[PDB]
């Protein structure tokens, strides 16, 4: 029994990982119709930031050699025309590098042995020209997607293992995986947006959480645990810079457990050492990126290290509130002083977009950039419909019941006011997971799209219902406990099958015929080195296909993109036309591409259209003729005499418009 249980746990974890992989693949094939799409049409299916990421993978796989492809992407001069940038550490393009490094030898070795990894067939679309659709592992798109989905499949396994760890039973893991599967749409979006950074990084973040829970539960230590924690932290840090903030919320969780005498000294040392080593390795592998410093993650590392290493000097303290308050003050003071003392003190860059978005929601801070962020609904408050969906499947009620039970047991089992510095109070992993859930819930409620973190932790905390100690021990017998636990599963199936049925009976649309004509015209009527400017979603696809150099791009986290974007988007302002022409000449752009729906009044949500956004950023030019009116008039009357410096070179069916800067 002691060995049959563990083998069964591991096998079920692998099985649920495979099932999740198959499910996400089916959803992706239903949504995007890649089975009957040409290669350039798949690039079109990769929209605003997905296209910018995939273009570097395509660049490396088409380079004469892997090293020259890396040298070309680390000395890039076509993403931001005017200077040279290193996109490998700026955009976190390590997954692309790894996938290309694996793809090139694979096709090279398959070709030598004549293995037919790719099969191509003609697809007749209709009035448009027929194209060729190639399906197989040899196709670069399918190789990339298979890598993404193989990585993303392990999230179900990690959730199963976390459910087993916090409940000591397979029933907890089953509850966690069932809650994850019935709320799959509200938990992840990798099926609809593969090339996003979170698709690569979140599995490693949740794996790191699982390993940390295992280490805390069994009080492990040594170099092996450090290696295990680092092998998850480093890949998660090299991908998705936002990972840093996530690892901040983990640290704040660990501290709150450690201050309650639930984490021994040696394992705390092991955890903090693993974090230090992982941060150093990531900082060195990201070419000394200053924005990694002066984040919230490094000062937190230093603060928690100092808190841990001064813990034995305070072992004589008996009043628990004083101990906890003193530790919290030291932690907060160190992290705040180090963050302020390096960003404002020395000007070591920093990415304060999170703080600015949060300031605009509570205060009256408006800004142009925060207005771009908070009018898209994936950076606004969470919607009530999502809460209704989560309560309908009985995920939130289960989590609330489990949290109440844990709080009651913790209160009844722990001496609140007096501490003994030599006794470990047990159940530290559960408290760490509960505090992490609270942090993730606050994050997701403030900014929607941070649900990626909240929903799996709700599934994990729901598994506390299967913990025997929390819910009566031997007072609820064993036959009753199993009887009630299968009842919960039966009720969950009754309210989860409709959700998965709905999620499987949704078929997407894949026409987008206008952008294909626009890109065809770009490829035929413009030269290879023509510089293009416009809205960022259009620019990322203009770079991905037609390979033309661009000025601005949708990657907005770093610095020196906001000024370029603010200068490019002046074509929608009320500035004099000569001034915007001079601005375009100074940036060196040749063509400007936009849509006629970008210059449309809304009157339902003003000041989320560019017409109303520019009045706050440029009050003095209010009362002038808006540039959008001139663009619409020129596109309609077909004679571009009033816009003398500019000239409309592309105008088809009044959707996409391309102006030439003379």
């Amino acid at each position, epitope marked *: 029994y002691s060995q049959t249980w563990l083998a069964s746990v591991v096998i079920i974890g692998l099985l649920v990982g495979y099932i999740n992989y198959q499910h996400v693949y089916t959803l992706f094939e239903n949504d995007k119709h890649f089975s009957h799409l040409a290669d350039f049409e798949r690039e079109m299916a990769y929209r605003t930031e997905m296209g910018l990421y995939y273009s570097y993978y395509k660049t490396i796989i088409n380079a004469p050699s892997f090293l020259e492809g890396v040298q070309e992407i680390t000395h890039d001069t076509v993403t931001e025309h005017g200077h040279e940038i290193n996109t490998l550490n700026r955009f976190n393009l390590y997954p692309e590098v790894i996938l290309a490094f694996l793809y090139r030898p694979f096709r090279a070795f398959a070709k030598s042995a004549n293995w037919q990894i790719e099969l191509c067939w003609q697809v007749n679309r209709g009035e448009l020209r027929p194209v060729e659709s190639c399906e197989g592992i040899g196709n670069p798109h399918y190789f990339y997607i298979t890598g993404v989905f193989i990585v993303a499949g392990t999230v179900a396994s990690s959730i199963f293992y976390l459910g087993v760890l916090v409940s000591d039973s397979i029933f907890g893991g089953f509850l966690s995986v069932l809650c994850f599967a019935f709320n799959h749409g509200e938990a992840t979006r990798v099926q609809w947006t593969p090339p996003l950074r979170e698709s690569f990084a979140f599995p490693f973040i949740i794996g790191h959480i699982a390993i940390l829970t295992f280490v805390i539960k069994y009080k492990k230590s040594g170099h092996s645990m450090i290696l295990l924690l680092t092998s998850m932290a480093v890949p998660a840090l090299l991908f998705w810079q936002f990972t840093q903030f996530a690892f901040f919320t983990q640290i704040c969780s660990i501290f709150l457990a450690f201050s309650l005498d639930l984490i021994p000294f040696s394992t705390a040392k092991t955890v903090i050492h693993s974090h230090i080593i992982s941060f150093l390795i990531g900082f060195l592998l990201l070419f000394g990126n200053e924005m990694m410093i002066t984040a919230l993650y490094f000062p937190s590392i230093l603060a928690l290290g100092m808190i841990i290493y001064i813990s034995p000097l305070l072992s004589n303290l*008996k009043f628990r509130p004083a101990y906890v308050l003193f530790l919290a003050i030291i932690f907060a003071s160190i992290t705040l002083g180090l963050k302020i003392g390096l960003s404002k003190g020395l000007g070591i860059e920093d990415d304060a977009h999170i703080f600015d978005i949060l300031r605009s929601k509570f205060t009256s801070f408006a800004n142009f950039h925060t207005r771009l962020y908070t009018c898209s609904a994936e950076f606004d408050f969470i919607q009530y419909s999502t809460i209704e969906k989560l309560c309908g499947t009985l995920l939130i009620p289960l989590a609330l019941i489990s949290l109440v039970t844990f709080v009651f047991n913790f209160v009844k089992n722990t001496n609140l006011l007096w501490r003994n510095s030599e006794e470990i109070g047990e159940n530290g992993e559960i408290l760490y997971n509960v505090v992490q859930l609270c942090c993730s819930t606050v994050m997701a409620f403030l900014i929607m799209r941070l649900k990626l973190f909240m929903t799996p932790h709700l599934c994990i905390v729901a598994a506390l219902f299967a913990n025997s100690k929390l819910l009566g021990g031997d007072r609820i017998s064993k036959t009753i406990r199993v009887s009630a636990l299968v009842g919960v599963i039966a009720i969950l199936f009754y309210r989860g099958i409709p959700n998965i049925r709905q999620q499987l009976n949704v078929k997407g649309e894949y026409s987008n015929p206008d952008q294909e004509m626009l890109f065809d015209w770009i490829q035929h009527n413009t030269k290879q080195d023509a510089v293009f400017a416009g809205t960022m979603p259009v620019m990322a696809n203009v770079k991905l296909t037609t390979l033309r150099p661009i000025v601005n791009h949708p990657h907005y986290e770093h610095v020196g993109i906001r000024e370029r974007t603010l200068k490019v988007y002046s074509m929608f302002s009320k500035k004099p036309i000569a001034e915007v022409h001079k601005i375009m000449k100074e940036m060196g752009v040749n063509y400007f591409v936009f849509q006629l729906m970008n210059c449309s009044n809304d009157e339902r949500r003003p000041e989320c259209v560019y017409r109303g956004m520019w009045d706050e950023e440029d009050p003095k030019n209010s009362g002038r003729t808006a540039l959008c009116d001139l663009w619409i008039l020129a596109a309609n009357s077909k004679d571009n005499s009033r816009i003398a410096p500019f000239k409309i070179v592309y105008n088809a069916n009044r959707n996409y418009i391309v102006l030439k800067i003379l």
Partner: antibody
Amino acid sequence: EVQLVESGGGLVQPGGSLRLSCAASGFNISSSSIHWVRQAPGKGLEWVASISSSYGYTSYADSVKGRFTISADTSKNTAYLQMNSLRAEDTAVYYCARSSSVYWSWWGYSAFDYWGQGTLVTVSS
Amino acid sequence: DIQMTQSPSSLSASVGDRVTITCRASQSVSSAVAWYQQKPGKAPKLLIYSASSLYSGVPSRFSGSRSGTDFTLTISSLQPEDFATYYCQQGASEPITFGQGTKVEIKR
């Protein structure tokens, strides 16, 4: 000098209510915590209850939690202890001792330095 | 919920003899232990606090020693006056628990 005086002991019938007081001379209240210690005949010292009047903390022993009540005022520098539903083994001599305040516990309570003379109370039928 | 156990419940020694009384704590109270002396029919008085500090007023003959979670109060020279009951107290938890109480006698 600093001293503790207690009054209210004597004879009472079991199951009734008693209401005694402990006053202090010298130090002002709310600067320190005060505890009640009982001693039964032929038995040792048993801690009963404690109160810090600085911000209003009261604590009781498990064996007597649910009957005892302490209220301390700051104007007249004294505390008032009330018992109800006395048992047959609650007879004892009570002492009103002084120690450091709970809010400044900080490595624990200080030892009882200034004790009270104690009042003897008996329950009889 | 903490037990203050004294093994020498009854101790008989002559005048001038060195006497030692031990005190064992179930938990790990660091230095929150105090010693009290109570005369028959009187109120207890503080002798030793923090297991190593001598109260101002008690003669310096009294000594307190600590080893782990074990504590001891010793008197080098026994005299007529230090004939009373001795109590051991802990102060690291809200339920304050006293020792069992040891009685000193006159060997004759």
